[PDB]
Amino acid sequence: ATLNQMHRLGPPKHPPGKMGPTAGRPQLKGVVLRTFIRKPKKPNSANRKCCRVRLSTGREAVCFIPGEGHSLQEHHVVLVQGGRTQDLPGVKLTVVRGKYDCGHVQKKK
């Protein structure tokens, strides 16, 4: 704008970050509620294996299971991370595989 105007409002500052689903934490603990399946957005189609967890922050959320095949039951603990699924609406949480009651997707050799 004009100078006086740029003086009245000062310099531009860059806005502090909006935290993700994990709320600033790189991973989180979780306890499963019900395993189920959800349908992808339009141009492509499948059915993905998905889960519901409670977190140490007390909040319940939808998280996703990467890989094919798994052993997941209620009350099983998992480590979750901030990977966002492109396929599904609003599923921003992903179970890290290889820790706790989720072992690596089993080799077929």
Partner RNA sequence: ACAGGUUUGGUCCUGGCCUUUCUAUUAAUUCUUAAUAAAAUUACACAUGCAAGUAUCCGCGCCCCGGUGAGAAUGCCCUCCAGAUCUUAAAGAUCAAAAGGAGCAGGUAUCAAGCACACCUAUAACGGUAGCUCAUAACGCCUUGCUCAACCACACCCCCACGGGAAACAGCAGUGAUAAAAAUUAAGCCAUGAACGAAAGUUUGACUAAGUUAUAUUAAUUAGAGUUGGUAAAUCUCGUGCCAGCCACCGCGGUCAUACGAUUAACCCAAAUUAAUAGAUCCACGGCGUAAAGAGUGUUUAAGAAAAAAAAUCACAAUAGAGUUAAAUUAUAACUAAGCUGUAAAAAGCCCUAGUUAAAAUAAAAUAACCCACGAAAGUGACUCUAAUAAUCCUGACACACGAUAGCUAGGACCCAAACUGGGAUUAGAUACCCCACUAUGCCUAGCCCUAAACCCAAAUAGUUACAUAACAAAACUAUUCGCCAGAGUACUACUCGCAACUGCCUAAAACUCAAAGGACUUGGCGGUGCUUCACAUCCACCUAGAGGAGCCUGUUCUAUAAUCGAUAAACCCCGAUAGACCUUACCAACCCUUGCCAAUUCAGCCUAUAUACCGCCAUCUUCAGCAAACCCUAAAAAGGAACAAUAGUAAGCACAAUCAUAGCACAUAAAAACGUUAGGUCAAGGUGUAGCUUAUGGGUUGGAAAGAAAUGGGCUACA
Partner RNA sequence: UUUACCAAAAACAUCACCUCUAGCAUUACUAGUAUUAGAGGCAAUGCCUGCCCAGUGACAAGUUUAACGGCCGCGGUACUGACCGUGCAAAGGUAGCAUAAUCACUUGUUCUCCAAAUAAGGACUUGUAUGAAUGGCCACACGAGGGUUUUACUGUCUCUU
- Which spans of this chain sit near RNA (rule: CB under 7 A)? 1-6, 8, 12-22, 24-29, 40-41, 43-49, 55-56, 66-69, 79, 81-87, 89-90, 92, 96-99, 104, 107-109
Q: Which is nearer to Mg ion, 26 or 58 (CB)?
A: 26
Going by C-alpha positions, the residue among 78, 101, 65, 75 that lies closest to residue 30 is 78
Q: CA 82 to CA 94: how far, in whole Å?
A: 6
Q: At its nearest, how many Å lie between RNA and the CB of residue 52?
A: 15
Q: At its nearest, how many Å lie between Mg ion and the CB of residue 83?
A: 4
Segment contacting Mg ion (CB under 5 A): 35-43, 67-75, 81-89, 98-106?
Answer: 81-89
Cβ neighbour number for residue 57 with a 10 Å cutoff: 13
- For residue 88, give the DSSP letter: S
Q: CA 89 to CA 84: how far, in whole Å?
A: 10
